[PDB]
Amino acid sequence: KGPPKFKQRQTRQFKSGFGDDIPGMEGLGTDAFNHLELHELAQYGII
Amino acid sequence: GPPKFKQRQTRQFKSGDDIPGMEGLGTDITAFNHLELHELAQYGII
Amino acid sequence: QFAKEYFDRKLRVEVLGEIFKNSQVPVQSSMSFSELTQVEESALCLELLWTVQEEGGTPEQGVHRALQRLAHLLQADRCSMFLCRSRNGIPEVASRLLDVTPTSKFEDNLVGPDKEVVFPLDIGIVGWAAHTKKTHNVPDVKKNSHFSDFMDKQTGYVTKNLLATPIVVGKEVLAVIMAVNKVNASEFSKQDEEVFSKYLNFVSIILRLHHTSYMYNIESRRSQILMWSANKVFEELTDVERQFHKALYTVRSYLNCERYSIGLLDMTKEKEFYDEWPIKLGEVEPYKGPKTPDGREVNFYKIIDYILHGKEEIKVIPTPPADHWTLISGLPTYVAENGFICNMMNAPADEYFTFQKGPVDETGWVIKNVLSLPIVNKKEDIVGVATFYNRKDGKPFDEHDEYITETLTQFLGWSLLNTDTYDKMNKLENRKDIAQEMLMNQTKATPEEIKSILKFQEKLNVDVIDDCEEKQLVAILKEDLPDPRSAELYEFRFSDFPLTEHGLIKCGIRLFFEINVVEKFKVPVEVLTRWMYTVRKGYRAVTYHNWRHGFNVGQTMFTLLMTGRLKKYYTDLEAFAMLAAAFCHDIDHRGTNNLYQMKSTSPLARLHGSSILERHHLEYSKTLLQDESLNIFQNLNKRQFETVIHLFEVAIIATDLALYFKKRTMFQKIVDACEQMQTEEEAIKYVTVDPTKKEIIMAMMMTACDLSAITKPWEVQSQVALMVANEFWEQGDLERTVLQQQPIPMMDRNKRDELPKLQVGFIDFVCTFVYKEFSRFHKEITPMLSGLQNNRVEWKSLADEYDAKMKV
Amino acid sequence: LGEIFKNSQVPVQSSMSFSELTQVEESALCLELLWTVQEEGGTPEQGVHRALQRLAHLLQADRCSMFLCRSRNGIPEVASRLLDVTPTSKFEDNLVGPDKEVVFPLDIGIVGWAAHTKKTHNVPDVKKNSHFSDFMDKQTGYVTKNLLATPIVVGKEVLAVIMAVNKVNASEFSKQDEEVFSKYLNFVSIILRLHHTSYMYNIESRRSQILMWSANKVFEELTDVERQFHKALYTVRSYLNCERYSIGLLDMTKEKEFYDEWPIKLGEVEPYKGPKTPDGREVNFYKIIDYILHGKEEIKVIPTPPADHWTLISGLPTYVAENGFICNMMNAPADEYFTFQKGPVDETGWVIKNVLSLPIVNKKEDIVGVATFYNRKDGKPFDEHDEYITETLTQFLGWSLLNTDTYDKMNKLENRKDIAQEMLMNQTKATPEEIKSILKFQEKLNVDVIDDCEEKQLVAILKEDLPDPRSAELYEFRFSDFPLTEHGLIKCGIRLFFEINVVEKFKVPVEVLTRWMYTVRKGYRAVTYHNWRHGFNVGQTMFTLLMTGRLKKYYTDLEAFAMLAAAFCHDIDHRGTNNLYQMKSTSPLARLHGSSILERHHLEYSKTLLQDESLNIFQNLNKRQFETVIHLFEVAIIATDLALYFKKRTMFQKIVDACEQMQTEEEAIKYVTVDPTKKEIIMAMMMTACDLSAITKPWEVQSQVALMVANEFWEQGDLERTVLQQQPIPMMDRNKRDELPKLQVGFIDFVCTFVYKEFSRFHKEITPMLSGLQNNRVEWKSLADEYDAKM
Ligand SMILES: Nc1nc2c(ncn2[C@@H]2O[C@H](COP(=O)(O)O)[C@@H](O)[C@H]2O)c(=O)[nH]1
Ligand SMILES: Nc1nc2c(ncn2[C@@H]2O[C@H](COP(=O)(O)O)[C@@H](O)[C@H]2O)c(=O)[nH]1
Ligand SMILES: Nc1nc2c(ncn2[C@@H]2O[C@@H]3COP(=O)(O)O[C@H]3[C@H]2O)c(=O)[nH]1
Ligand SMILES: Nc1nc2c(ncn2[C@@H]2O[C@@H]3COP(=O)(O)O[C@H]3[C@H]2O)c(=O)[nH]1
Ligand SMILES: [Mg+2]
Ligand SMILES: [Mg+2]
Ligand SMILES: [Zn+2]
Ligand SMILES: [Zn+2]
């Protein structure tokens, strides 16, 4: 005889995948000297 | 003063020696001729 | 007569239908419950029975109907209902229905959350009734020790007599029912208590239905919160902020809160030495302020706001100021400092916390109820504070909402394993990449080593840049490389002892040039030389499995392909990949067997389950081929490169001896089938039609090349066997000292004099089969087997001497 | 009969009126029926039984009955709960147990049509309705010729169907009977609604507890599939509420090895024929975990179970693995297809009654395992609520498969990192030949390769084969490494270590010291400027500062040992690109270390070198001394970052000013030594001075070194332009080559001048350094002004 009918898995409930569709995620993944030093220090690539 | 507040509840879900049968669960282990079974081990082939 | 009720029993169905239909709708008014005939009392019971069957609506309507029924049955007035709640583990009672009077509309009786009056169980006789869960009947309440007059002062109504009975289901009290100020009499009555209880039975039925529905709803909400949080957490590995945002945003429909936010604390426990210098030197005063129990400073480095009451927006504030509407009150800082679950009703009314008493965002939203909970690590360390603001219904947070949010925060705290694991994954991957890059830099041949072989600077007078064409480089390299005929590279009897390792590199490049693959596949000369030198440097300084072994194996394959005439079955690309795999079959050999890797639980053994060292060699060869400078297979199609990679895998994995032992039989069958063919071309077609036959033959060629030293002349074979014995004895010493296990007789130094006999036992066990089958396959490989036999005789002689030495 | 007209006669005795007495007694009985539900410890079946008895008495009917509604496999069905209920009948005899029920699908039976239509159905003649079924009539030998059934619907869901059959004194159930039935069944609906809501609450509580405990056990520790699944199931044991259940894990190997495919392709072995999962893998249960809950609470694990295992004897687990359905089965042994065990399963008296089997599904919709739940604790078959609970549990396990995979990836990454680090250490570590090239024990001690010589003898022989410290101006600030080869630099470094009297004091091995020096040299790459020569120059400058600069009086011998070692290892494994390129190119170094990327990399690499027992120069000193050395090492290497020096310039200036006001050197030494922070600040400034000491060299050395630094910076700028598509700063821009002098002047006036000015103020013996710097600046000015003449 044929097997009895059986219910299918309810994959539609949580099918959804992961991404930036959640609002506010664009700015969520990642997060000192004197005035004269601000430019001279960067000009020498020290920082 | 601050009102009396509820303390955190951790004992209920605080709860492998406890779990039986875990000794034979960490790692699972699964060919040649009759004479080869000893000669291969003799020469370190396996 | 003679028919008593029988006809009435027959017609009773119509009477029951009539009375049900004509008593469901109409409402009866009557007084005092003792001037009532049984008929109208039964009709009242039917009225309340229908009222119990809500069929949709709210329990307060039925409770109020019952309360007015009781008011005009008891000859009392101003009946009241007090709903019992629990906040912070402290039970309380609020007023839900006040001043219930017969023929009084329901809307005026209901008390909203704004105007409710809350009593602790230690205040008022309602508190004692709820505490003891027993019926209380007190006259002259002014003389009672439990009566509280706060409500009387608030409403300006005096009470003299009362009868309060708590409603209890499942050992939990839900409401307290009051009838006060009996008219025209005092002391109430015992029958009054009886009717009070018998109708509070209806009230308890209604309250039980409502409470069971509410409990089911909150449990369903908790289960769905758990489902959604688990689904979002297990989607991928991510840090604290994104994981918490996903989990909290997905469950926004099950948290009945107009607004809620989460604030994350700084996780840095200790500061750097240079930041500690000003504090130690005293130039900067020590930091004084809020501190978590672990000792860290309370610094919220990021806050996520979820606004749901109006237009839904999710504001993310990095490094929020103290002016932020969440932190203006001290509740989040208090939670971070202490770690208690804080439930606050009528938040602005509190004095300790400076909650805003008006609109906060200019949108007209005012804080009314607050619930704040901490999130903890495995080490009971606070990581964040989740604050849930005023409930959607307007009622204050109760024990059930605290249950829901506490379970959510417990799950979130447990979920930090997937964040710590994410950070560990990133650190491990970065460290592995750095280690591999520095290893490749250390191993890759320096430009000076390339200039040693490819002497472009001494023949083209450039000395600076490889700006010449490939033809010039090929011409320069061809002259420098040794001639294969002079160095006996084609012969089976080739011995690498006279040549130096640099000479071996030159001979390897010459071998690559001999099979005519550099020109056909456009392999750059500089790339080829660099790859050869890198492969040479990859081999360690062990006794036997050094660069010389790799070169001997490669040259044996070159001899088999060219001198052995085994190139007829293989194309140019297959021969190229086969030679390249032969030269790298033992790259980076530590100096131990696979058994030592298994027993010692080496990282190689844990990384690769079976054929440990062979898979390691294959992986390292592929890693070498990945680099653009070292890739001799650069100018090849995707399909050709895939074929080369497949041949690499097959060759290097089949290098081992267990696979050869298991697959001897198929090679024997192939040789037997090819032996009966009448013509050479038929055999070539038979072999080349099926790719599996070519793979088996190439694997057996790998095995034959790997053991080629047996077929070398006696002078070479004695030295090679001594080298192999020394390596095995070193492995045995390592096993005895480290693993504390007695080694097998071959790897024991005390059995050194037994080396001859064992080698005899080797020759007739492993090598003789493959070499005899190859001799039967191709007659050109006849000398190899022949040489092998000669070698055996020599070893046999030595064994005989041993048999003499121990005989005396 | 009909002679006397109908009247509501007043009995006077025992009754005021017939209708009034009827109403009063009906109200009283209905009140008692409602109170039945408040009696804790009872069941709703008792209240339904009382209501059905009253209904049978009132309607003059016979055999009132109730059929409860279930949902299995997504399809509804009914099952008799109360049967043959008659007035004055015992409840125990009327109730039907789960093992004696008769199950009707919705499409057959009048009960089925009543449940489907959700409305009252009154059939006068059962033979005129196609929905009538004879199953119960032939089963029990009872004839039915009249039926009236109304379903009990709450929340748009049917709970039970209640019928009355074969009115004794009439051949039809009139409309008034239907109305009375409807109202009494409304009261029964209230009772059943209370019961169903309580059952729903219990089911949801069990589900929530399952989720709590599964989450707690999954996040407790990162483990493999087997241990994690075992923990979760063993924890949620109580909340499943099943007599026995098991889980079987399928092999996930989707591809065969090439050496296991040759016989299949050659035809030696016949191709596999049998069950297959939807992915295509062969159905091979490689582990079965059986949980025993009926008695003794046993738990067993069967690795590589046989086909004779009691779980796999029936085809249900294999069927689930093949198809992926959710299988709910009642009276499984009676089924023909799956061949369940009709008799006892094992030696104990246990039989299979109901089965619920669900698959565990990966992210890729692959089938990882099959979870089979056997007969329920109570005799009732599995409902849709048990399917709900078990489906949630299996979904949670399929989700935690991600954590299992992440654990496997963790193990693989850790093993690969360990292998790579070991191979790198083997490549970098100095070969024995290189050590013998310096410690010539073979050519001078006449000993074999194996070293059995005394340590003192090794010290004595090595001290005769090293450059003279007084010669080659090792103690002077004018030292130039140009006339020295790199092997000579290694020898001079070992001599510098000997000169401070720490090899004998701390009993460091000679071979270990030589191997460490050679390994440190080989660690430095072949870049233009940040090569081994720069490291040795920094080390020699630190030695000069300690000895010639008289700074050793502020530090102990162990501290000076640490200073020299960290100075030699301050720029190890430098790639030739500064921190800005590391951040801008998203290098793995920048992702691993946040601030001071190169300095932290050098510190980590040098500590890794010191970790090995064959290179541990601090092998023979105490644990506390080793911790002190490690902290000193960290401070020294991190201080080489010029941003930190820029931040701590003011602190060092304050320290120098405080020390300058004391007229006695002993007072200054006491002031500095008592505070470790002051020593650390002075040490950081000393490291910065050593790093920048190339400026203070004589003019020829400074010019050549500046050319080397410029050539390195131009290479970095060109590479940045090529691979980052950004314009380099003028200092690193090759097209600004002729701007090299002016920039250097600025570099002297901005960075280097403060260190040497403050050191000359602090110590007069370091005066020449500053002097040299000034001279160099003048020379650079002579090159800048000429450029203005060239313009
Ligand atoms: N007894 C003996 N074993 C050998 C000889 N040559 C190779 N072998 C074995 O064969 C193995 C070949 O694998 P390979 O190490 O070359 O990848 C060696 O590791 C060693 O175990 C030999 O001359 N005598
Ligand atoms: N312009 C210039 N910069 C230098 C000179 N010597 C060192 N530097 C700078 O100082 C840094 C010191 O870093 P470290 O040597 O610790 O890697 C160098 O990377 C470089 O930026 C120099 O002679 N001229
Ligand atoms: N004005 C008014 N007071 C009430 C009513 N029901 C109870 N109270 C009073 O509110 C009080 C709350 O505390 P108590 O229980 O001590 O006593 C209670 C009663 O005296 C009501 O319907 N109207
Ligand atoms: N013996 C018995 N049979 C019943 C009773 N109520 C219904 N049935 C029968 O069980 C049958 C189930 O399917 P049907 O509804 O078609 O018809 C039903 C009736 O014939 C009962 O109280 N006792
Ligand atoms: Mg090998
Ligand atoms: Mg540096
Ligand atoms: Zn080999
Ligand atoms: Zn430096």
The string of DSSP letters for D5-33 reads PP-----SSS-S-HHHHHHHHHHHHHHHH
CA distance D706 to D713: 10
**What's the gap in Å between the CA of D315 and the closest CA on chain B?**
24
Best probe residue, ligand 4, of D89, D101, D144, D147 (max atoms within 8 Å of C-beta): D144
Which of D324, D337, D646 minimises the CB distance to A33? Answer: D646
Residues 6+ apart with CB under 8 A from C91: C84, C85, C120, C121, C130, C131
Location of structure tokens 């004509």? C22
Distance D81 CA to ligand 4 centre (A): 12
Contact yes or no for C340 and B40 at CB 8 A? no
D505: tokens are: 């004091």
What is the atom index within ligand 1 of the atom nearest the CA of C721?
23
CA distance D168 to D63: 10
Q: What structural domains does chain D harbor?
A: 43-201 (3.30.450.40), 222-398 (3.30.450.40), 432-790 (1.10.1300.10)
The secondary structure of A1-47 as a DSSP string is: -PPPP-BPP-TTTT----SS-STTGGGTS-----TTHHHHHHHTT--
Q: Decide: helix, strand or coil at residue D107.
A: coil
CA distance C150 to C131: 19
D786: tokens are: 């000429």
CA distance D316 to D352: 13
End-to-end Cα separation, chain A, in angstroms: 79
The DSSP bridge partners found for residue D285 are D250
**What's the gap in Å between the CA of D639 and the closest CA on chain B?**
45
- Going by the DSSP 8-state scheme, the letter that residue C744 receives in this structure is P
- Phi, psi of C264, rounded to the nearest 5 degrees: -105, 135
* CA distance to C137, D139, D330, D334, D392, per residue, from A7 (Å): 59, 30, 14, 20, 15
C68 lines ligand 1 (CB under 6 A): no
Cβ-based burial of C693 (10 A; exposed 0-12, middle 13-18, buried ≥19)? buried
Q: Are strands D62-72 and D121-123 parallel, antiparallel or unpaired?
A: unpaired
Q: Is the distance from CB of C72 to CB of C94 less than 8 angstroms? A: no
Is D691 annotated as a binding-site member?
yes
Which of B13, B25, B30 minimises the CB distance to D230? Answer: B25
- Phi, psi of D39, rounded to the nearest 5 degrees: -75, 95
Contact yes or no for D289 and B26 at CB 8 A? no
Contact yes or no for D231 and B26 at CB 8 A? no
Count of C-beta atoms within a 10 Å radius of residue D263: 15
C130 lines ligand 3 (CB under 6 A): no
Ligand 4 binding pocket, CB closer than 6 Å: D 63, 65, 83-84, 104, 109-111, 132-133, 136-137, 140, 142, 144, 163, 165
CA distance C723 to C473: 38
The CA dihedral of C222, C224, C230, C231, to the nearest 10 degrees, is: -170
- Phi, psi of D47, rounded to the nearest 5 degrees: -65, -40
Residues 6+ apart with CB under 8 A from D110: D121, D123, D126, D129, D131, D132, D133, D147, D149, D163
Q: Is the distance from CB of C303 to CB of C262 less than 8 angstroms? A: yes
Distance D83 CA to ligand 4 centre (A): 8
C702: tokens are: 């790998």
CA distance C215 to C447: 77
Chain B residue with minimum CA distance to C610: B46
Q: Is the distance from CB of C249 to CB of C242 less than 8 angstroms? A: no
CA distance C71 to C80: 10
A41: tokens are: 């220090």
Location of structure tokens 């497949």? C646
C20: tokens are: 């049900």
SS (H, E, C) C147-214: CCCHHHHHHCCCCCEEEEEEEEECCEEEEEEEEECCCCCCCCCHHHHHHHHHHHHHHHHHHHHHHHHH
HSE-CB at C280 with a 13 A cutoff on CA atoms is: 16
Q: Decide: helix, strand or coil at residue D507.
A: coil
- Phi, psi of C297, rounded to the nearest 5 degrees: -75, 145
Q: Is the distance from CB of D121 to CB of D150 less than 8 angstroms? A: yes
Per CB-CB distance under 8 Å, the chain D contacts of A41 are 643, 646
Please report, in range form, the residues annotated as the binding site of C for a divalent metal cation: 549, 585-586, 706
Count of C-beta atoms within a 10 Å radius of residue C486: 7
Report the Cα C337 to chain-centroid distance in Å. 31
Cα angle at C591 between C590 and C595, to 5 degrees? 100
Model resolution, angstroms: 3.1
Amino acid occupying residue D237: R
Chain C residue with minimum CA distance to D423: C439
- Active site annotation includes C545: yes
Q: Decide: helix, strand or coil at residue C797.
A: helix
Q: Is the distance from CB of D355 to CB of D390 less than 8 angstroms? A: no
Contact yes or no for C406 and B36 at CB 8 A? no
H or E element that contains D456: helix D455-463
C553: tokens are: 């194996």
Cα angle at C371 between C369 and C375, to 5 degrees? 165
Residues 6+ apart with CB under 8 A from D41: none
Closest CA to D411 of C424, C433, C233: C424
Distance C151 CA to ligand 3 centre (A): 6
Q: Decide: helix, strand or coil at residue D70.
A: strand
CA distance D21 to C231: 63
H or E element that contains C302: strand C300-307
Percent helix, strand and coil across chain B, each to the nearest 5: 30, 0, 65
H or E element that contains D83: strand D75-85
Closest CA to A28 of C305, D680, D273, C683: C305
D275: tokens are: 């069950």
H or E element that contains C80: strand C77-87
| Residue D357 backbone zone (phi > 0: left; psi -120 to 50: alpha; other: beta) | beta
Total count of residues recorded for chain C: 808
Cα angle at D77 between D72 and D81, to 5 degrees? 110
Q: How many Å is the maximal CA-CA distance in chain C?
A: 145
Q: Decide: helix, strand or coil at residue D419.
A: helix
Distance C735 CA to ligand 5 centre (A): 19
Distance C552 CA to ligand 7 centre (A): 9
Report the Cα C77 to chain-centroid distance in Å. 65
Q: Decide: helix, strand or coil at residue C268.
A: coil
Residue A36 touches chain D, beta carbons under 8 Å:
no
CA distance D535 to D602: 12
Amino acid occupying residue C760: V
Q: Are strands C382-388 and C369-376 parallel, antiparallel or unpaired?
A: antiparallel
Question: Taken in order D607, D613, D615, D619, is the CA torsion positive or negative?
Answer: positive
Location of structure tokens 């081994």? D532
Which of B16, B21, B30 minimises the CB distance to D301? Answer: B21
D151: tokens are: 């379903």
Amino acid occupying residue C404: I
The DSSP bridge partners found for residue D68 are D79, D160
Q: Is the distance from CB of D48 to CB of D192 less than 8 angstroms? A: yes
Cα angle at C178 between C172 and C179, to 5 degrees? 150
* CA distance to C462, C625, D43, D150, D525, per residue, from C446 (Å): 18, 17, 88, 93, 11
Residues 6+ apart with CB under 8 A from C20: C46, D179, D180, D183
C59: tokens are: 């329990």
The DSSP bridge partners found for residue D328 are D356
D647: tokens are: 């931040």
Contact yes or no for D227 and B21 at CB 8 A? no
CA distance D7 to D670: 125
The secondary structure of D757-769 as a DSSP string is: HHHHHH-GGGHHH
Residues 6+ apart with CB under 8 A from D528: D576, D708, D709, D711, D712, D715
CA distance D259 to C699: 10
Contact yes or no for D580 and A37 at CB 8 A? no
H or E element that contains D149: strand D147-154
Cβ-based burial of D711 (10 A; exposed 0-12, middle 13-18, buried ≥19)? middle
Q: How large is the angle between the packed helices C525-538 and C612-626, nearest 10 degrees? A: 150
CA distance D187 to C580: 88
**What's the gap in Å between the CA of A24 and the closest CA on chain D?**
24
Catalytic residues of D: 530
Contact yes or no for C301 and A22 at CB 8 A? no
Per CB-CB distance under 8 Å, the chain C contacts of D688 are none
H or E element that contains C531: helix C525-538
